[PDB]
Amino acid sequence: ALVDGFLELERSSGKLEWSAILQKMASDLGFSKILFGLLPKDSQDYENAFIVGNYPAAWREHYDRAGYARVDPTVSHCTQSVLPIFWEPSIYQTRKQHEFFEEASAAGLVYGLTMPLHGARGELGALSLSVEAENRAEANRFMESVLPTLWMLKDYALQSGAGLAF
Amino acid sequence: GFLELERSSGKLEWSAILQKMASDLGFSKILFGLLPKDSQDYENAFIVGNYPAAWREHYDRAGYARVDPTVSHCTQSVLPIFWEPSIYQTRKQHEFFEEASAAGLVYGLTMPLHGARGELGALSLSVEAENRAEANRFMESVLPTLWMLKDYALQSGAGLAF
Ligand SMILES: Cc1ccccc1C(=O)Oc1c(Br)cc(Br)cc1CNC(=O)c1ccccc1Cl
Ligand SMILES: Cc1ccccc1C(=O)Oc1c(Br)cc(Br)cc1CNC(=O)c1ccccc1Cl
């Protein structure tokens, strides 16, 4: 129930409740782990982004410490496009990106996609969602099956989330 | 049909592809409008589509971008705005609703466009129906597809425009 979810987000109070609702929307849809990240207009301060979700804490910590925002191919994608980027080995091209892939894989981030977020007031962000699957073909099958719902979800989360972050 | 949008060469072909996509989906007339980062020069926007020419000319001449409630909505939101009578609130907006309605833009919605490089825009789509309830039923039925379509149109259109 997408619209119901949105209304729940917009009747929530504080970051904890908002994050619980969003995570449950994603979980119900069939995704595993999620990260919603948002920066205000003109900011490139990734290490101080508004971050929501259930990525493993030690991974989030590692990412900040290693300055992976500068290497993560989804981040660079988000600066150039409003279209999703699917997590495939082909997006990891540089030597650093291969290292990144290995570390993200260890944290359970193998299959999934990232939806770039570009808000009405210049907010810049991402909604990333991982998928538990036995192979790429099955992960892609699931993602296709829910892509239209998720496409609406990312914009509802952006509109609501932007008000909470800022 | 985003690959068709990208395969295309020039505005004429792009416009024809987008219009067909909207028609095939069940919409009547469409407008894709786009401005570059920081611009509020609505009278010089990049505009694509099949809105009646006389209507587009009127909108520019009356400076309706100052009163159009979908324009204000786009500055504040990434979410659709359906063309409900309730959105036209001020005296000038009532007049706008009357004139737009005469142009065949009675039922429909506008999807705000916010590009990765700060582009600001709208994809507006009108629906022919016997009443608003019937139009609203149709729009809800194709909304997921449209929601994808607007982002594909934006990514491609931004390249074409700028
Ligand atoms: C805040 C922001 C703005 C614009 C674009 C991205 C972000 C953002 O939150 O980036 C981040 C930040 Br900070 C921290 C972390 Br942990 C993760 C991301 C986004 N990257 C991914 O979700 C991802 C995708 C594929 C494989 C591995 C990973 Cl880790
Ligand atoms: C360029 C732009 C940026 C941001 C938001 C909108 C635009 C844009 O193209 O606005 C315009 C411009 Br210029 C010209 C015209 Br003719 C129409 C619009 C958008 N408005 C509508 O489509 C509409 C909606 C409901 C009822 C009647 C109408 Cl006419």
Curated annotation (Swiss-Prot), chain B:
Stretches that traverse the bilayer: none
GO MF terms held by the record: DNA-binding transcription activator activity; DNA-binding transcription factor activity; sequence-specific DNA binding; transcription cis-regulatory region binding
An annotated GO BP: regulation of elastin catabolic process
Keywords noted in UniProt: Activator, DNA-binding, Quorum sensing, Transcription, Transcription regulation
Coiled coil (residue ranges): none
Keyword Ribosomal protein found: no
Gene Ontology, cellular component aspect: protein-DNA complex
Organism domain of life: Bacteria
Other remarks on this protein: LasR in strain PA103 is not active, this is probably due to the change in position 180 of the sequence.
Family membership: Belongs to the autoinducer-regulated transcriptional regulatory protein family.
Task performed by this protein: Transcriptional activator of elastase structural gene (LasB). Binds to the PAI autoinducer.
Protein name in the entry: Transcriptional activator protein LasR
Source organism per UniProt: Pseudomonas aeruginosa (strain ATCC 15692 / DSM 22644 / CIP 104116 / JCM 14847 / LMG 12228 / 1C / PRS 101 / PAO1)
Gene that encodes the chain: lasR
Portion held of the full protein: 6 to 167 of 239
